[PDB]
């Protein structure tokens, strides 16, 4: 019964058009709940889950100002980093920022994070102690010096251990009906012959939340891994997830195989068989 809040920011420069595109999203666990998009008409932080709509306009007002200021800072940092890397004002670049907190089953702080990237690679990150920073390269070192001399880590830590955790707890309460659920996967198996002496068995899990899941093929009780083809867990579009796993078997050997299915919403692992 661990939970986490995470915010994701992406700023992309748009050389030859105008200001950067800036996109913010917020999650509690695997569930999205707010968004800000610099292009959109509204210019507001916007609800994305039924249970955050009960917040009064003053929440939206504060979220919208804070997110806006983040946006401006990211816009200026794109300029500086372009310099640091001797890049050019004709090229498009990306800053990404990921932060938030974990709480344990009881609501109390376990872990806090914040990390930044440039053009899809690590740039700088807050360490586990929340008091110090790792810089991925020479440019990020310049940043790290500024942040050390500003005592930025101290303000990160105070948010991550304070407000991050408080608002997470609140949201877990206001949204307990969706957020604290465990929808077990609906499962089934399919069978396509593909030669004379060969068929695909595909094992399916649909409708589950949270997204964390394991699917495993066995042959006479022993885990395969060599011929399992398996897709990334993908979202369904209604807050649930899907996933599958396939294995190519000799035709006639179908009952030797079993698919094992692990999920937090399942009292015990499931075993599927083509039967």
């Amino acid at each position: 019964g661990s939970h986490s809040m995470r915010y994701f920011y992406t700023s992309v420069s748009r050389p030859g058009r105008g200001e950067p595109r800036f996109i913010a999203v917020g999650y509690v666990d695997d569930t999205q709940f707010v968004r800000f998009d610099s292009d959109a008409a509204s210019q507001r932080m916007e609800p994305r889950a039924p249970w955050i709509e009960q917040e009064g306009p003053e929440y939206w007002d504060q979220e919208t100002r804070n997110v806006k200021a983040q946006s401006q800072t990211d816009r200026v940092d794109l300029g500086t980093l372009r310099g640091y890397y001797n890049q050019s004002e004709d090229g498009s670049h990306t800053i990404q920022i990921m932060y938030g907190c974990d709480v344990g089953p009881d609501g109390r702080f376990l872990r806090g994070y914040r990390q930044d990237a440039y053009d899809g690679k690590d740039y700088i990150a807050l360490n586990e102690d929340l008091r110090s920073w790792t810089a991925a390269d020479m440019a990020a070192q310049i940043t790290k010096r500024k942040w050390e001399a500003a005592h930025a880590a101290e303000q990160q830590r105070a948010y991550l251990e304070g407000r991050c955790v408080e608002w997470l707890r609140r949201y877990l309460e206001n949204g307990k009906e969706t957020l604290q659920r465990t929808d077990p996967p609906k499962t089934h198996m399919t069978h396509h012959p593909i030669s004379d002496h060969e068929a695909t068995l595909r094992c399916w899990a649909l409708g589950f939340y949270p997204a964390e899941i394991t699917l495993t093929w066995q042959r006479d009780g022993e885990d395969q891994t060599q011929d399992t083809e398996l897709v990334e867990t993908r979202p369904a579009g209604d807050g649930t997830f899907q996933k599958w796993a396939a294995v190519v078997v000799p035709s006639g050997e179908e009952q030797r195989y079993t698919c094992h299915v692990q999920h937090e919403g399942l009292p015990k692992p499931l075993t599927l068989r083509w039967e």
Partner: peptide, 6 residues
Amino acid sequence: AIMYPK
């Protein structure tokens, strides 16, 4: 809820 030295 989300989160110039002289």
